[PDB]
């Protein structure tokens, strides 16, 4: 037996592997696991994850602030049709809506 | 003029906090509550999930609202837009 | 006791893209409903695959076909890319 | 007494119509809202005490909401579950 | 003779279970829009016809609601800009 | 070849559905959500096919794609 490190660690990745592997078998989903399905469900939650943190960073930047909000992570939604369809399904607490017009309202 | 109102939707969409009273709201959901069941009681948080649930669901009816009047080549609502509103989305 | 959540992960996380930014009290509760949502679709989606293929195993091909039923655009190819990326690299 | 819904106030109605992006509103309206309002708490509050009722609680959790919200197709972040 | 009775439609394409859009155009149709993702495809009988119901019942779903759309915004007749109200407001042309 | 789909058909559905007056550039647009709705019906019933790894597209994958959208369906594999 040797002092213990993260599976995660071999595999590349940055979310908990070992519990991911816990979920998908506590939750009755299958009564077998596949050595890979866990570190490939943790690495595409990461990807997924990542791919909208950059949008919710950016959100903040295009606001100039520093510490994410609500409405940072609303806005990274609607700069994404990934994420306008993903989350279409999804109420954001605090996030509020796009700012928008139909022209008609405009004066002249 | 009759029409600085659209200042008020910049405002009104700048912001994103909750626009109902929390207390109404608060009465309003014991109220639906205790004439549906004895002895129901919410948590803060419930309450908050419920109001923030409904509010978007609101701006949602407004926005879907809005473009029934724009399709009906209007500037302005009745309750027929919202009953189209309904009915075009099966409600 | 402990309450099964990723609170400090998205924050290890953010240093991929903004080693810069804070996150809010309420933004980290928003993330930690994302990323269990998307777990939520997927062990759904990749069980009733399962299901219509009778297997006992769930598997990588499982997670790769429910993926394409999650997203429509090309980030559902760059996430299989990863998975398949990480399962290679963990049993190599 | 305000309990009629009554107390959801006009100028409350007319803020969440104003982020909504409406212009003018007929005076009708703000009781044809209450009207949506009550029956949208008809389906949310109602299966959200079915919740409650699954452990029988006198507590409402957000949980118990949120798997209301979750079956009747309105997912909500931020209070989990 | 010309220019009366249009229920003359109405009235013949829904006395029965039958489909409006004939059989081998339509198995024509869906395979060079289906090798795009992958080709070398074959298909069951059962399979395109199977397509084929649920699109028919759809477009009538989406007219069902047109017609009133047209009504409401002070017309008899339906045009493209109803579909562009009702298909969002459902939340599909999204 | 799009145009299989005939203009007395698109008119049929619109028929079947109950319209009256019509405007006629609704043919070509109808043609355009058709064809959007067919290849997504298409489109996950293919992805549900290369699952079970045989090249013919086979009655229940179109059942599981149609199922995921909500739809149910019968006399065809149901």
Same mark, same amino acid.
């Given at each position: 037996?040797?002092?213990?490190?993260?599976?995660?660690?071999?595999?590349?990745?940055?979310?908990?592997?070992?519990?991911?592997?816990?979920?998908?078998?506590?939750?009755?989903?299958?009564?077998?696991?596949?050595? !890979?399905?866990?570190?490939?469900?943790?690495?595409?939650?990461?990807?997924?994850?990542?791919?909208?943190?950059?949008?919710?960073?950016?959100?903040?930047? *295009?606001?100039?602030?520093?510490?994410?909000?609500?409405?940072?992570?609303?806005?990274?939604?609607?700069? *994404?049709?990934?994420?306008?369809?993903?989350?279409?399904?999804?109420?954001?607490?605090?996030? !509020?809506?796009?700012?928008?017009?139909?022209?008609?309202?405009?004066?002249? | 003029?009759?029409?600085?109102?659209?200042?008020?939707?910049?405002?009104?969409?700048?912001?994103?906090?909750?626009?109902?009273?929390?207390?109404?709201?608060?009465?309003?959901?014991?109220?639906?509550?205790?004439?549906?069941?004895?002895?129901?009681?919410?948590?803060?948080?419930?309450?908050?999930?419920?109001?923030?649930?409904?509010?978007?669901?609101?701006?949602?009816?407004?926005?879907?609202?809005?473009?029934?009047?724009?399709?009906?080549?209007?500037?302005?609502?009745?309750?027929?837009?919202?009953?189209?509103?309904?009915?075009?989305?099966?409600? | 006791?402990? /309450?099964?959540?990723?609170?400090?992960?998205?924050?290890?996380?953010?240093?991929?893209?903004?080693?810069?930014?804070?996150?809010?009290?309420?933004?980290?509760?928003?993330?930690?409903?994302?990323?269990?949502?998307?777990?939520?679709?997927?062990?759904?989606?990749?069980?009733?695959?399962?299901?219509?293929?009778?297997?006992?195993?769930? +598997?990588?091909?499982?997670?790769? +076909?429910?993926?394409?039923?999650?997203?429509?655009?090309?980030?559902? /190819?760059?996430?299989?890319?990863?998975? +398949? /990326?990480?399962?290679?690299?963990?049993?190599? | 007494?305000?309990?009629?819904?009554?107390?959801?106030?006009?100028?409350?109605?007319?803020?969440?119509?104003?982020?909504?992006?409406?212009?003018?509103?007929?005076?009708?309206?703000?009781?044809?809202?209450?009207?949506?309002?009550?029956?949208?708490?008809?389906?949310?509050?109602?299966?959200?005490?079915?919740?409650?009722?699954?452990?029988?609680?006198?507590?409402?959790?957000?949980?118990?909401?949120?798997?209301?919200?979750?079956?009747?197709?309105?997912?909500?972040?931020?209070?989990?579950?």
């Amino acid at each position: 037996r040797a002092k213990a490190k993260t599976r995660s660690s071999r595999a590349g990745l940055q979310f908990p592997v070992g519990r991911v592997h816990r979920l998908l078998r506590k939750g009755n989903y299958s009564e077998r696991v596949g050595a !890979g399905a866990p570190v490939y469900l943790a690495a595409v939650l990461e990807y997924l994850t990542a791919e909208i943190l950059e949008l919710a960073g950016n959100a903040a930047r *295009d606001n100039k602030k520093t510490r994410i909000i609500p409405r940072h992570l609303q806005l990274a939604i609607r700069n *994404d049709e990934e994420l306008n369809k993903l989350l279409g399904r999804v109420t954001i607490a605090q996030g !509020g809506v796009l700012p928008n017009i139909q022209a008609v309202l405009l004066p002249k | 003029p009759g029409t600085v109102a659209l200042r008020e939707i910049r405002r009104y969409q700048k912001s994103t906090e909750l626009l109902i009273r929390k207390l109404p709201f608060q009465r309003l959901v014991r109220e639906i509550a205790q004439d549906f069941k004895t002895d129901l009681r919410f948590q803060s948080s419930a309450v908050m999930a419920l109001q923030e649930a409904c509010e978007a669901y609101l701006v949602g009816l407004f926005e879907d609202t809005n473009l029934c009047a724009i399709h009906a080549k209007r500037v302005t609502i009745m309750p027929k837009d919202i009953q189209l509103a309904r009915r075009i989305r099966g409600e | 006791s402990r /309450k099964e959540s990723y609170s400090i992960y998205v924050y290890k996380v953010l240093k991929q893209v903004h080693p810069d930014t804070g996150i809010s009290s309420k933004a980290m509760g928003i993330m930690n409903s994302f990323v269990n949502d998307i777990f939520e679709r997927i062990a759904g989606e990749a069980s009733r695959l399962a299901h219509y293929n009778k297997r006992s195993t769930i +598997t990588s091909r499982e997670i790769q +076909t429910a993926v394409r039923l999650l997203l429509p655009g090309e980030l559902a /190819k760059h996430a299989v890319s990863e998975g +398949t /990326k990480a399962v290679t690299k963990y049993t190599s | 007494l305000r309990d009629n819904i009554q107390g959801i106030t006009k100028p409350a109605i007319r803020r969440l119509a104003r982020r909504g992006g409406v212009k003018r509103i007929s005076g009708l309206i703000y009781e044809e809202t209450r009207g949506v309002l009550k029956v949208f708490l008809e389906n949310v509050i109602r299966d959200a005490v079915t919740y409650t009722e699954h452990a029988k609680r006198k507590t409402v959790t957000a949980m118990d909401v949120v798997y209301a919200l979750k079956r009747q197709g309105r997912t909500l972040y931020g209070f989990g579950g």
